[PDB]
Amino acid sequence: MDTQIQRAYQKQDGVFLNSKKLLAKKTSAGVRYYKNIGLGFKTPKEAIEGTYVDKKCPFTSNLSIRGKIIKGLVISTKMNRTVIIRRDYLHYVRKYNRYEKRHRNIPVHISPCFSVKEGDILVAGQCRPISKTVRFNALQVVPNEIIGSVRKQFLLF
């Protein structure tokens, strides 16, 4: 009644079981879409016993992950199940023979399963284009503490 309607006008799964399950009145009916992107990645416990209907998830959908895999710090928590990760790298300068600092910002999609927080390191995978920016989904989240400015924070992670 909550996870289902909640504003939006319906939220099923990829494997349209449900209502039909009432046919198997004895074993386990409460099926949800289960998956495992593999690639050396554990599938979130929370992902399984959730009521969430996120088609853009890498464990609850026919969303693949291929090639490019990222690790970066998180900037913002706003946006619906989407986050911006900031990567901090050095650039070399041919002439002066030294480096300068630089940061690329990245649009990342977050399946409800893992719980966000601002200023923590995150691991993204290469998933098909989900929107103008998005092209990365979160696969493994590590909580971390930064006392204040996320901008000030710059780590060659």
């Binding site: 289902q4 309607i5 006008y9 319906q10 099923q12 349209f16 449900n18 209502s19 039909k20 399950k21 009432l22 046919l23 009145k25 910002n105 103008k132 920016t133």
Partner: protein, 207 residues
């Protein structure tokens, strides 16, 4: 040349974005194809109309413009018969599509219980016509009629909502097919989770 190139946009940082390429033909964008219903030939004689469009590879893609009959499946029973759709209600996407009884992939509609009624009768010995005459079996109980029982006893507890539906002649179901893409209109019969829910949208919608 209604294109869909992502160039006429503004990069992340909303700054306008350059162009050196005239609209290129592979960015094709075909004219939308609203899809109505002939469950009211008050004007509309030609029941269903489907126009085929020459697509890329060289294939054809049939486009549904006007319809009246689609195919639907009862999840639970695994039955599927072609039936006449009735009126479109609640399109979610927008209420105007309902106002023009347009057919979106996921538009919730009504159908004729006839094929399902006809079937539920033959396989269980239960017509579903007004409750009292409920069952209709055979005179002698020695032979194969012993099965309509076995099935009937399968506590065919078809939700109190599924039952009312039949008798009323109307049946709730959502669609699962792009008319503007394949020309057809196929849907599943509404039940449990969504049934209860979509109905609510309808109860509260009118009240």
């Amino acid at each position: 040349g209604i294109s869909r190139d992502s160039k006429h946009k503004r990069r992340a940082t909303g700054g306008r974005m350059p162009v050196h390429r005239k609209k290129r033909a592979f960015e094709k964008g075909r004219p939308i194809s609203m899809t109505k219903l002939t469950t009211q030939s008050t004007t509309i004689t030609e029941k269903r109309r489907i126009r085929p469009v020459r697509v890329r590879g060289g294939h054809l893609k049939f486009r549904a413009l006007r319809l009246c009959e689609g195919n639907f499946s009862w999840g639970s029973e695994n039955i599927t018969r072609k039936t006449k759709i009735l009126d479109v209600k609640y399109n979610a996407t927008n209420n105007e599509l309902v106002r023009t009884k347009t057919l979106v992939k996921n538009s919730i509609v009504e159908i004729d219980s006839t094929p399902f009624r006809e079937w539920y009768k033959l396989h269980y010995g239960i017509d579903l016509g007004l409750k009292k005459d409920r069952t209709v079996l055979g005179n002698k109980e020695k032979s194969r009629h012993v099965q309509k029982r076995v099935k009937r006893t399968k506590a065919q507890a078809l939700e109190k909502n599924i039952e009312e539906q039949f008798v009323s002649q109307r049946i709730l179901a959502c669609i699962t097919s792009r008319p503007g893409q394949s020309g057809r209109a196929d849907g599943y019969i509404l039940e449990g989770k969504e049934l209860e829910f979509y109905i609510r949208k309808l109860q509260s919608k009118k009240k």
